[PDB]
Amino acid sequence: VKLLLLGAGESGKSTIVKQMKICHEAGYSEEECKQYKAVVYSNTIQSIIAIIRAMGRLKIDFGDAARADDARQLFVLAAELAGVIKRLWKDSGVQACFNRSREYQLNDSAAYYLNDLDRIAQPNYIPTQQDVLRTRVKTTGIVETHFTFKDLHFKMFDVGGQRSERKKWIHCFEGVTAIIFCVALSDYDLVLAEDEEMNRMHESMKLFDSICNNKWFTDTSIILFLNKKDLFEEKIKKSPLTICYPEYAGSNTYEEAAAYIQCQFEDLNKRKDTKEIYTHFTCATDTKNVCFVFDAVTDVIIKNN
Ligand SMILES: Nc1nc2c(ncn2[C@@H]2O[C@H](COP(=O)(O)OP(=O)(O)O)[C@@H](O)[C@H]2O)c(=O)[nH]1
Ligand code: ALF
Ligand SMILES: [Mg+2]
């Protein structure tokens, strides 16, 4: 079996791969985690530094004037760093800005790491499976991973999903059993990182429409993962799906919006009466899910194949 993990930038592709090693292989060894210790430490800082650079751009102020020394020592250091980062994370000014995160770029896992700060900052800190799932590394190029399942030799190819990487795709097309197209549900109200005047989700719909109907997959199963449902569930509550879809006349319910974004995506499907779209909703950082949905994923291919 040959699967292709296609999607836009930060849609969750790489986080779905990590989940394959956890459901089908023994989930990350204590040293295999320690290897991501530096990346965690790195995501955390970049996360906090992003907020502080954001406040000054949006002209937001702190809550206490003691954030000068903290945010200043934070840039100089670039172990008191922990406390320094801690104090910052609390401050009303910081938090107030963290909400308007949509207006700029912030690591999805930012809240995660900074909330588990004390644990993460302990000398003998050995990152957990989840900590490794949460990490952020821009994928550049093509990463291959082979593994077995219900007897099939799976060869999963995970590529970078960005305007600059989307060209390296054509060579991993011919032999391809099925592909998983990951969509970040929470991208409805954000804009591209390569173009500021491009709704992150419309970009995904352009890509999906392109892949979904590309002739090289007339017989390749198309799986749609509407990833980041957990972040989507927290964002419609304070943001209108109208920002992405002006025609959207339904309610601001995680359930209705989600059943619009879905329909939106599947309607782009040509080869319509001769091809089905297997849509799911996922939370890539939740092993329970990724395997429950993947369990169905393998099953559908077993039917179709
Ligand atoms: N909260 C949450 N974060 C996610 C989810 N899927 C991925 N992420 C995080 O989003 C970031 C980007 O995902 P990644 O898989 O590296 O991107 P891709 O490889 O470009 O598709 C990583 O830091 C992930 O931990 C999800 O369903 N929920
Ligand atoms: F943004 Al990517 F893999 F598509 F890190
Ligand atoms: Mg990647």
XYZ file of C-alpha atoms in Angstrom, residues 176-289:
114
model
C -0.354 5.590 -5.154
C -3.014 3.390 -3.491
C -4.779 6.301 -1.740
C -4.029 9.761 -0.385
C -4.946 11.584 2.841
C -5.622 15.279 2.289
C -5.254 17.170 5.573
C -7.123 20.421 6.138
C -6.630 22.608 9.226
C -10.173 23.346 10.175
C -8.979 26.352 12.225
C -7.602 28.031 9.083
C -10.987 29.549 8.044
C -10.083 32.871 9.594
C -6.349 32.976 9.005
C -4.312 34.008 5.962
C -1.406 32.252 4.105
C 2.180 32.774 5.333
C 3.381 33.069 1.696
C 0.531 35.543 0.851
C -1.216 37.739 3.412
C -4.226 38.280 1.185
C -5.215 34.585 0.826
C -7.561 32.856 3.199
C -5.730 29.779 4.486
C -8.804 27.686 3.805
C -9.552 28.884 0.314
C -5.974 27.918 -0.522
C -6.742 24.421 0.810
C -9.901 24.223 -1.316
C -7.878 25.219 -4.380
C -5.337 22.472 -3.567
C -7.933 19.897 -2.782
C -9.919 20.698 -5.909
C -6.683 20.314 -7.815
C -5.723 16.998 -6.287
C -9.185 15.579 -5.994
C -9.693 15.819 -9.774
C -6.131 15.313 -11.015
C -6.450 12.371 -13.431
C -3.620 10.314 -11.823
C -6.089 9.294 -9.056
C -9.121 8.079 -10.963
C -8.664 4.875 -8.955
C -6.725 6.329 -5.927
C -8.947 6.632 -2.819
C -9.237 10.232 -1.589
C -9.385 10.649 2.170
C -10.217 13.943 3.685
C -9.040 14.670 7.198
C -10.580 17.859 8.646
C -7.820 18.215 11.157
C -7.499 20.612 14.069
C -11.173 20.105 15.082
C -10.182 20.778 18.679
C -8.842 24.194 17.762
C -11.826 24.746 15.483
C -14.169 24.028 18.365
C -12.528 26.798 20.408
C -12.458 29.378 17.667
C -15.887 29.555 16.137
C -17.038 30.578 19.570
C -15.288 33.874 19.071
C -14.895 34.246 15.293
C -17.432 33.960 12.433
C -17.147 31.391 9.678
C -18.355 34.349 7.550
C -14.734 35.559 7.516
C -14.027 32.637 5.248
C -17.485 32.131 3.756
C -19.538 35.324 3.392
C -22.542 33.278 2.162
C -22.551 31.119 5.362
C -26.051 31.699 6.757
C -25.915 29.051 9.417
C -25.015 29.418 13.091
C -21.672 29.796 14.829
C -21.777 26.211 16.088
C -18.768 23.952 15.953
C -21.233 21.391 14.527
C -22.913 23.421 11.788
C -19.815 25.209 10.595
C -18.013 21.869 10.497
C -20.815 20.401 8.400
C -20.432 23.254 5.934
C -16.680 23.180 5.571
C -17.108 19.451 4.893
C -19.813 19.834 2.256
C -17.806 22.706 0.813
C -14.832 20.437 0.250
C -16.638 17.395 -1.186
C -18.620 19.461 -3.742
C -15.317 20.288 -5.535
C -15.251 16.612 -6.423
C -15.587 15.941 -10.181
C -15.512 12.247 -11.315
C -18.433 12.767 -8.945
C -20.658 9.742 -9.728
C -17.513 7.624 -10.341
C -15.511 8.572 -7.193
C -16.236 8.777 -3.452
C -14.681 11.085 -0.809
C -13.995 9.652 2.651
C -14.300 12.593 5.044
C -13.357 12.530 8.761
C -12.724 14.880 11.568
C -9.559 14.562 13.535
C -7.340 15.840 16.286
C -3.869 14.831 15.086
C -2.377 15.104 18.598
C -4.818 12.609 20.061
C -3.720 8.980 19.559
C -7.173 7.653 20.456
C -8.592 9.458 17.453
